[PDB]
Design a protein around this ligand. Structure first.
Ligand SMILES: NCCc1ccc(O)cc1
Length: 370
């Protein structure tokens, strides 16, 4: 229940290119590296010899493959992916010792989806059916797993910022965090949606209507590199960070329009403030806060990209946030747990923190309605 030695360190990645897990599909098993994404709900894998791919799903070689005779098309601002739906037997070698029949989208055509030079060939959507394509009747992988086996309905992620981490399926491993876990309610089961109730730059409040911290929505997404903030919030966030760091920078840097560079080991972390997000707690009028460092929002590419950016889809707590914490996707109890990661990067002066309880009133007002 609190120990899963087989699953520790089962994630790999490259900075900026997400985290992937090894999976097998079909009989006999075809091994594939699969992007772990809590911000989507489709299990989709390369199914054709696209030049960027090390390997791909070869349906003809699998005796357990079943055609669903239906296509799916997933557009993005940039490009897209499109594929043919089927089901096959699925395992996770460094995961629970089970095999499940799952929906799989065999990707036959894509644009700006696969990355030139990456070691992954598909995507594992870990969120809920509501945002699955083409519709909510296509059961996501994790639902299928829970329905078909005795695996408990939760998973946890330790992302360590080349890069590594752990995906514990069906439980929590207490060696992956220190201190206590703090839980925030899943507002609605589609994305992993939560509510931010207060934001502090260097222990100083932004004094904004908290309804806008979640303008549209706030989600926990392992497929996004950045901490992403709603336009109005990003505007005020930058402004405060800008004035907090008036110790030493181009204008385009703050909009992600260019990079900023320093000499090896001369990176000024201390001229940058800590950032605290207060999340809604499990108890009426009770919240807690998570605190990340510039280590998190200044991502190396010594040249670094400012890892905070504006959005029209709301707040996104991506790898910037997640790399500081052990994160528990407690689906059975409709809540997300946060604790200090036993692997997060810090200095001798400041470390990542999860603290509570705090008294916060009108937290429901922070939740934006359709
Ligand atoms: N939710 C999609 C996450 C994603 C990001 C980048 C990429 O190339 C493919 C997928």
């Amino acid at each position: 229940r609190g120990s899963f030695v087989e699953m520790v360190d089962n994630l790999r990645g490259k900075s900026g290119q997400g985290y992937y897990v090894e999976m097998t599909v079909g009989s006999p098993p075809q091994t594939l590296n699969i992007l772990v994404d809590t911000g989507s709900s489709n299990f989709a894998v390369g199914a054709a010899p696209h030049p960027f791919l090390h390997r791909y799903y070869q349906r003809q070689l699998s005796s357990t493959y079943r055609d669903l005779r239906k296509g799916v098309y997933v557009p993005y601002t940039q490009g897209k992916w499109e594929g043919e739906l089927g089901t096959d037997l699925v395992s996770i070698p460094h995961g629970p010792n089970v095999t499940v029949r799952a929906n799989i989208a065999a990707i036959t055509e894509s644009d700006k989806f696969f990355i030139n030079g990456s070691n992954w060939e598909g995507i594992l959507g870990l969120a809920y059916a509501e945002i699955a394509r083409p519709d909510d009747s296509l059961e996501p992988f994790f639902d299928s797993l829970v329905k078909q086996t005795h695996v408990p309905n939760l998973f946890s992620l330790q992302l360590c910022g080349s890069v590594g981490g752990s995906m514990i399926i069906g439980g929590i491993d207490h060696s992956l965090y220190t201190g206590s876990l703090w839980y925030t309610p899943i507002r609605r089961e589609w994305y992993y949606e939560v509510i931010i109730v207060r934001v502090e730059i260097n222990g100083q409040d932004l004094k904004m209507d908290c309804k806008e911290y979640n303008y549209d929505k706030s989600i926990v997404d392992s497929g996004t590199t950045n901490l992403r903030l709603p336009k109005k919030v990003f505007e005020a966030a930058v402004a405060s960070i800008k004035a907090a760091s008036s110790t030493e920078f181009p204008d385009g840097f703050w909009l992600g329009e260019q990079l900023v560079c320093w000499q090896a080991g001369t990176t000024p972390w201390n001229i940058f403030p800590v950032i605290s997000l207060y999340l809604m707690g499990e108890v009426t009028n009770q919240s807690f806060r998570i605190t990340i460092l510039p280590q998190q929002y200044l991502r190396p590419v010594d040249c670094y990209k400012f890892a905070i950016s504006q959005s029209s889809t709301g707040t996104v707590m991506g790898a910037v946030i997640m790399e500081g914490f052990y994160v528990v996707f407690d689906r059975a109890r409709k809540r997300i747990g946060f604790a200090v990661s036993a692997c997060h990067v810090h200095d001798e002066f400041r470390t990542a923190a999860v603290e509570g309880p705090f008294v916060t009133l009108d937290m429901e007002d922070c939740g934006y309605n359709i």
